[PDB]
Amino acid sequence: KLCLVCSDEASGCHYGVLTCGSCKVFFKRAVEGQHNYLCAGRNDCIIDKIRRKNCPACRYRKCLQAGMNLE
Amino acid sequence: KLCLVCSDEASGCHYGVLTCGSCKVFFKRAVEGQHNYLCAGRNDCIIDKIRRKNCPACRYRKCLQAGMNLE
DNA sequence: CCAGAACATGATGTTCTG
DNA sequence: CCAGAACATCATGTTCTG
Ligand SMILES: [Zn+2]
Ligand SMILES: [Zn+2]
Ligand SMILES: [Zn+2]
Ligand SMILES: [Zn+2]
Numbered sequence: 001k002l003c004l005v006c007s008d009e010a011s012g013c014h015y016g017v018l019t020c021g022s023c024k025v026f027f028k029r030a031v032e033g034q035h036n037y038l039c040a041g042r043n044d045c046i047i048d049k050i051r052r053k054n055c056p057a058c059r060y061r062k063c064l065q066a067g068m069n070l071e
Numbered sequence: 072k073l074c075l076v077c078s079d080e081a082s083g084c085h086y087g088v089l090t091c092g093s094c095k096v097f098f099k100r101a102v103e104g105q106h107n108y109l110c111a112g113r114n115d116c117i118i119d120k121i122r123r124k125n126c127p128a129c130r131y132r133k134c135l136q137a138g139m140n141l142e
Numbered sequence: 143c144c145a146g147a148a149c150a151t152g153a154t155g156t157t158c159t160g
Numbered sequence: 161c162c163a164g165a166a167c168a169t170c171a172t173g174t175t176c177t178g
Contacts, residue, residue, distance in 0.1 A: 015144095024145085025146085040116040041113065051110075052172095053153090085162070092156065096163095124171090
């Protein structure tokens, strides 16, 4: 049901974790990109259906803590 | 000469306030649309050149605080 | 059913026009 | 010099393809 990263409706088990489609592609793009992501807060942002756009640094961190992985 | 919103280099006085061009068009874009932004942190995100894209809500808030208006 | 590519959509920032 | 439109670009999200 619910994406474990952003709480939007999950679409299936992606990279070892139940996530939505946007989170699946975000994760792959993050790991495979150079990307210096910087939080504007305190490295603990709320990751929502909506707020997930705000902080890629916190979203990527939440992805890892959730267990996402490229095998 | 510094932008009062993000501390980047100001390009002139825009909508009543010394700002860079980035913040000038952002502000105009924000005041015109139906938007309703959400902060993922604690309504005090760091808005600088690097991080200004992270939180439109906090950025808009700094625009208003600095005194920006359509006149 | 899921990975990865592709195709839209966004928001953003610099250039152009009045 | 400034507002507002237009243009380029990039990050994100959905659909297509393997
Ligand atoms: Zn998600
Ligand atoms: Zn964050
Ligand atoms: Zn600025
Ligand atoms: Zn914020």
